[PDB]
Symmetry: C2
Subunit: 260 residues, 2 copies
């Protein structure tokens, strides 16, 4: 009844202690930090490069991952993995580790969904995840998260295009080279929220618990616009004319800074 694994051998260890250790099953555990804001394709490259991972995935395509995970909806994949420092034992498969990540996300989502605020325009749980991923990728201060959420949810409710750059970046796929021009924002893809109305078909990244909570409980504001203030915050507005003013304020601040 010997339990295989990675064990710790002290200098003057006894035979008595060693047999106890080799049966205890108390293995050394390895870290895999799966960080919020990253994609599954990021997580899959980490798994390939991680020490002592049994590679049971034929390739790192998303559909293969949905196959191996036996997902009910294989289009509901991105954003459905809980971000954490995951502890694994040596020779654990990639699939079982992703399975643990998926099941933990499902639980957190279901709790967020059932506890969500009244009158949100999400049709399903994937849309809550999609919105959460949009909130996560919108680079802001922690204090402004609820308001950023509010703007996007308000827009989704009334039929205004979301116009968020990360969704455009996602929709380009491997054509994105680090640059984002005006032509890129103008080219229609299924994810481009400058061209499409509503949420994109799925999430764009892995949402943190911070974003998921903001998607489920946004601030109660009438805001429909935000722009950088030039410090490193944002000014929030309810109408186009106020917004356009706040845009001019931002450019003044930038001119005063970048020009000599």
């Amino acid at each position: 009844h010997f339990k295989a694994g990675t064990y710790r051998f002290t200098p003057q260890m006894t035979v008595r202690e060693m047999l106890k250790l080799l049966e205890s099953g108390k293995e050394a555990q390895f870290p895999l930090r799966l960080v919020e804001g990253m994609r599954l394709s990021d997580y899959l490259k980490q798994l390939r490069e991680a020490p002592y991972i049994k590679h049971t995935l034929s390739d790192d395509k998303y559909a293969t991952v949905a196959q191996a995970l036996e997902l009910e909806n294989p289009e509901w994949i991105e954003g459905w993995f809980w971000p954490d420092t995951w502890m694994y034992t040596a020779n654990t498969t990639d699939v079982a580790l992703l399975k643990r990540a998926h099941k933990k996300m499902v639980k957190a989502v279901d709790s967020a969904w059932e506890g969500r605020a009244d009158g949100l325009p999400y049709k399903d749980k994937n849309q809550l995840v999609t919105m959460a991923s949009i909130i996560e990728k919108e680079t802001a201060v922690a204090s402004e998260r609820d308001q950023v959420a509010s703007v996007f949810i308000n827009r989704l409710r009334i039929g205004m295009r979301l116009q968020t750059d990360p969704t455009v970046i996602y929709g380009m796929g491997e054509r994105y080279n680090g640059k984002l021009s005006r032509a890129d924002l103008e080219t229609p893809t299924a994810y481009n929220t400058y061209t499409i109305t509503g949420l994109p078909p799925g999430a764009i990244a892995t949402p943190g618990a911070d974003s998921l909570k903001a998607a489920a409980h946004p601030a109660k504001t009438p805001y429909l616009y935000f722009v950088a203030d030039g410090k490193g915050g944002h000014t929030f507005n309810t109408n186009l004319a106020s917004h356009n003013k706040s845009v001019q304020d931002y450019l003044k601040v930038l001119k005063e800074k970048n020009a000599q």
Copy 2:
């Protein structure tokens, strides 16, 4: 004859193999990714949270770390650590891992220094490291790295203030809330390159091999200015008139993007 450590035992392992393993010293390796562009304080936090690290440092103050590593000049600390995925065996001390990181950087810096381009304005190796950390924190696109480097080194040579924001941030220390204003830019500190001429007294982050190379071999250009082009890249200039034009060009791009 027997070497103590953390080893892995397969289910069908023979006693022949176990004997071989327990002498070999080929332990389980644990990963720690120390990323370029991060500070030593970021690495120190990572060591506090890393599994199976023996924590010997009294505190994570840089003077403590300098004393424990026994540096000749304790002021030459920031930036002097090689960024990589470092493999450590269990029960390795925090100090021993940092010592490995330091030594590898020293070797890399010495090699960069001796092979460097002629007529660069650096007095010592710490200045090369300081400049490299400045290039590291400013470079957003890899094809523009040697030209960013060129601008800063051009300025350093002729006595034009470097006016680089990450150094203002470093100089504020814990007073930096996450936001940077005009008041922050105009307040003198030892690191503030809007007020001081030349390099700050030490590096501001860990440079990668990319930035360290660019600090030793910048592109031969007449540029003294760069500004964002509005679409991911930068536009480089030799004079203030041309730069102020490029600033105006950038502000129009932001006007078209943000205002509706």
